[PDB]
């Protein structure tokens, strides 16, 4: 879980987050989001089958965890998708393994 805010923040550095539902979903269609964080507390769960979907053609828990780990200080989030990463070692070797 500690693996996934270090690389937020390298995607905030080098300027590449698709942050919140629609845009999500524009980067998804597209070969640009090379990995998708979601949720799994939501309303409908129609969201969440969306997203998988698309994935198929990570999970994790809670909206307000991924709003802070976002860029807003806190709206709820829903769904991040990272474009360009920014950097590599250190945790995004053991997330990306994983």
């Known amino acids: 879980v500690t693996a996934i805010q270090k690389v937020i923040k390298n995607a905030h550095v080098h300027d590449g987050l698709k942050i919140g539902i629609r845009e999500v979903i524009k980067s998804i269609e597209s070969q640009e989001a090379k990995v998708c964080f979601l949720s799994d507390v939501c309303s409908e769960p129609a969201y969440k089958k969306l997203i998988t979907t698309l994935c198929a053609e990570m999970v994790q828990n809670d909206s307000k965890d ?23 070692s250190a945790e995004k070797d053991f997330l990306l393994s994983q």
Not at 66 to 88: K, P, Q, R, T, Y
Request: proline share 0%; no cysteine; glycine share 18%.
């Open 66 to 88: 991924l709003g802070h780990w976002a860029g807003l200080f806190i709206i709820g989030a829903s769904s991040v998708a990272v474009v360009d990463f920014g950097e590599d």
